[PDB]
Design a protein around this ligand. Structure first.
Ligand SMILES: *[B@@]1([O])O[C]([C]C([O])=O)[C][C][C]1[N]C(=O)[C]C1=[C][C]=[C]S1
Length: 360
């Protein structure tokens, strides 16, 4: 029973103090409710140029990029091109180190290979050095025992998942995920002609944007505006309405539960908790001392298909940007919060939960 006016008030009353407390120059917010997105913009995209945030402003998604990676992988599974149960080495035969035996594509996709680190080392600058890195990696755990959140893990899953397609990652993503969903302002590389829409990120007063790195597209490199992001959330909320038959299955695969780690479940990029969930559960789970820790897992085998009564979410950050998306399929409500400052994840989660609580 929530009016447009009431929703607009709860968003303003939550976001205005958040931006003040967290020194955030600009935010674009979408709330999905009653089958439609509702857009709210605040502050500046570029302080020096005095450019306001608009619904066309592009923000760096950081790790929300992993949700695209997960869905693209799922789409490849649904085409018959890959299986999560396949050995990693099926897709990279040059990866001959015997520590790789028993490590599945599932493990790469869900951070359970056995201690792959948060980042691909900066000294890795091409495929040969990327191979050397993986060949020299000494797993700290057996496969399927420990979750360690890692770009070096899901980044490689993304790269290998598109090999059978024959397309480079960017083209596979655009052809198979972005274009079918009409996400026409979502970019791995922002064309010169669209650069005027690209916000500056801000860190400690300084303007910054994300730098190139190995496996950046697959782990943290996507830029988008709040409209394309609202439409991404809507496709993930209600995949039954997506026309492309492999893509709708890929969305389901990305929201399936593969592992339980405490009160959360790992999907492909997406993370889930059972709905109903209290704020403290989700807020506390997002603290870096939990989220970046190596933690034991319980296998969900076979994987559980998408549970509609879920809090489905993902944080994403770069040096200058902080974003969050969350949705509850049972209730068909969801939220996107894009900001040009990286501020603490628990603050993102608290604000999002508060706003969605208003819609029941
Ligand atoms: B990704 O955003 O996920 C984690 C942080 C989070 O929960 O948002 C770890 C960092 C990931 N992002 C990147 O690796 C991209 C960055 C570039 C510079 C700082 S983060």
């Amino acid at each position: 029973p929530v009016s447009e006016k009431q929703l607009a008030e709860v968003v303003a009353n939550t976001i205005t103090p958040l931006m003040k407390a967290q020194s955030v120059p600009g935010m674009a917010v979408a709330v999905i409710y009653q089958g439609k997105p509702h857009y709210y913009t605040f502050g500046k995209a570029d302080i020096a140029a005095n450019k306001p945030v608009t619904p066309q402003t592009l923000f760096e998604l950081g790790s929300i990029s992993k949700t695209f990676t997960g869905v693209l992988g799922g789409d490849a599974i649904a085409r018959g091109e890959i299986s999560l149960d396949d050995a990693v080495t099926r897709y990279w035969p040059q990866l001959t180190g015997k520590q790789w035996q028993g490590i599945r594509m599932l493990d790469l996709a869900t951070y359970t290979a056995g201690g792959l680190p948060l980042q691909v080392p900066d000294e890795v600058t091409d495929n040969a050095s990327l191979l050397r890195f993986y060949q020299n990696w000494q797993p700290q755990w057996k496969p399927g025992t420990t979750r360690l959140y890692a770009n070096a893990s899901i980044g490689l899953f993304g790269a290998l998942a598109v090999k059978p397609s024959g397309m480079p990652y960017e083209q596979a993503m655009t052809t198979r995920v972005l274009k079918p969903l009409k996400l026409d302002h979502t970019w791995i590389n922002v064309p010169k002609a669209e650069e005027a829409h690209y916000a500056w990120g801000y860190r400690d007063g300084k303007a910054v944007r994300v730098s190139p790195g190995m496996l950046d597209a697959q782990a943290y490199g996507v830029k988008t505006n709040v409209q394309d992001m609202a439409n991404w959330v809507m496709a993930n909320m209600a995949p039954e309405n997506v026309a492309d038959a492999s893509l709708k299955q890929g969305i389901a695969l990305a929201q399936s539960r593969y592992w339980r780690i405490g009160s959360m479940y790992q999907g492909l990029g997406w993370e889930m908790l059972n709905w109903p969930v209290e704020a403290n559960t989700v807020v506390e789970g997002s603290d870096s001392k939990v989220a970046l820790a190596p933690l034991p897992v319980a296998e969900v085998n076979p994987p559980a298909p998408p549970v509609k009564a879920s809090w489905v979410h993902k944080t994403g950050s770069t040096g200058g940007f902080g974003s969050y998306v969350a949705f509850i399929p049972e209730k068909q409500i969801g939220i996107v919060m894009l900001a040009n400052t990286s501020y603490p994840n628990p603050a993102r989660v608290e604000a999002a939960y508060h706003i969605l609580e208003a819609l029941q």
